[PDB]
């Protein structure tokens, strides 16, 4: 049904896809803290919520910001219950134009931070018996490596925290042409209690490509 | 969502999952058909049905029987929405003792039925832009086949028809019905409009 | 590795890649027997195999047909090690434009058929703790329908009979000429390894060979 | 076919699939050279490859020991024409469990270091017009996470390159012999159409 009494963590939640579903989870009673890469973007994030939620800044890659954000929301609203990871980024190349740091960048940020979002939460989630985690995943072999990584991790960790109330999943968008409101029911759905017994699971949202 | 003035059929209705996906519909809005393979069995889906929809009596391997209830829905209830099939059995048996009939039985029962009725529902889908069709699909390498073809062939159709407002899915659980029901109910709901040609496992890890 | 000492019988050999599986057999030692389903096909496909094999004509739908090719293998050549279904056909149509007989033309042409030829060659493979069976997979509903259901087929009965020494394999071309997927001659390949002695622990696979599309 | 004219890199050599892979690559004409972590252990390749190769030792993760071991080769030998992936590790624990030291080594090891010696190996590929990458992928977050972006990057690459007369597979085992079988057929002349495939060696699991 609704989320009342939720708290939702939503990396990157600028624009399109991330604030779609920002502003979803917000009007079924969740509270809502969506995230950018600047303050300025913050503070958008911060209008549009109003008192419903809040904006943070958010690195995603380091590990001091990563403690510092959660913290925030651990402070001023409690345990994250919902995690949804959509702070992707892209840099294309063709394998041999493609360089280290266009390779790692992409893996810190679209893979490792998901390893490190998931570990952060659980503890809470674990304790709460329930947990939500969400990951959005749209010359590109380094996006490709990640996009992958994110789907067997969440189908190994979603295993793993079976038991536990936790559920695990991926969205996959399409990216008639796709739309940002459609992937937030997507999203909300799984995010809800009538996903319970859904896990490890990849929802494709493409209009059957 | 609600499924306000929509008609849905669903295929074995008289109990576990079927029946949870049938109640969950008419708790939601929807004029909801329940289907058995005995007139016995239909009244008893017709009893916790009550206002909301009506139980019949349908054999899925019988032509015939697919156009006379069709006919019967039409006439007292109106063109089929939602279609859920959930009609499948079992004849397990290694393959060297495994018959014809028990091979057969089930890819008409199993498969073969999710194309006559498809069908036979698409037409009038596509006359009102919109459509839901979901496959419930849990030695058994005939059950196996039956299966994997209901898979293929609802992600070929979904293909098919995908700009035509329906969409083609299947809810593979791991055989709680309600949280089976939960799950069929979200495709053939407007929430689901754009996931089509989907298999969506229900289990848990 | 070779085949020699072993039968091959591979249904639909006329051309393409089913005979392009056949010729690439025979080569390698083995005794294919190649299926038509008309009579002139298999007298195009003993002319083509020689000695080394002989042309029948099969119709996969018909049990008794089935039975009679088969018995005449035993007789003529003995028992069938290795089978490879390549005898599907194609009766495209959108699924409103799709008359019943289209649609179960295509399930016992393309699926019942790979069930009947592999129940009727598993007692003597299972006798001999070997088997091969390998299928051949590339609007069309009824077509998907079917292949689906032959992946799903091959993957249960491969687990079922695994430690039998028999393995139940798909091998998926990507439509081939009649940049490139493949040819014939490269599915024929694919069919060959699975079919060999390096291939006994690959059972239940769908080997795709479309080389990256 | 035969590995006559070829030389085949097979990274992790030391033992079991690795050993039994380079094994049979020689048996078949391929000059080969597997590598070690160890001098102790390339000394030990280096003995039961005999004439047929060389064994050298390796840093998967170690930009500069890629960067000198390939130097080595192309001076003693010449251009890689075969490379075979099997440098993984493990570091088990559950997720709460596990430490940012042991995730990433995981990383850089199994996925990063498959990205690293295939973009090293890609110019004297494409330049001969043949190629073969091969990669052995068999609480696991973290080597799971490493597993499926290998064939999420054997996939791509192999899609990228694919007309330049390259193949990028992965073989995904559940006898080490066997494993070298369907690594020998990719890298052979018969797979040369075969590529961004996941070839499973399980016998069905």
Avoid at 50 to 61: A, P, Q, R, S, T
Avoid at 81 to 107: C, F, H, P, S, Y
Avoid at 133 to 157: D, E, H, R
Wanted: a neutral charge; proline letters at 1%.
């Amino acid at each position: 049904m609704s989320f009342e009494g939720k708290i939702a963590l939503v990396t990157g939640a600028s624009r399109g896809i991330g604030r779609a579903i920002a502003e979803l989870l917000v009007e079924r009673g969740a509270c809502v803290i969506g995230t950018a890469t600047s303050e300025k973007g913050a503070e958008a994030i911060s209008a549009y919520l109003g008192e419903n939620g809040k904006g943070l800044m958010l690195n995603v890659v380091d590990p001091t910001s990563i403690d510092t954000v959660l913290a925030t929301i651990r402070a001023e609203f409690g345990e994250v219950d919902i995690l949804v990871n959509n702070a992707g980024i892209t840099r294309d190349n063709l394998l041999m134009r493609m360089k280290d740091d266009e390779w790692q960048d992409i893996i810190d940020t679209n893979l490792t931070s998901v390893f490190r979002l998931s570990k952060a939460v659980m503890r809470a989630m674990m304790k709460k018996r329930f947990g939500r985690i969400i990951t959005i995943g749209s010359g590109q072999v380094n996006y490709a490596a990640a996009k992958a990584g994110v789907i067997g991790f969440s189908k190994s960790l979603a295993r793993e925290v079976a038991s536990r109330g936790i559920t695990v999943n991926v969205v996959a968008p399409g990216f008639r042409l796709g739309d940002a409101k459609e992937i937030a029911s997507a999203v909300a759905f799984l995010a809800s209690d009538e996903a319970s017994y859904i896990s490890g699971e990849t929802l494709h949202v493409n209009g059957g490509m």
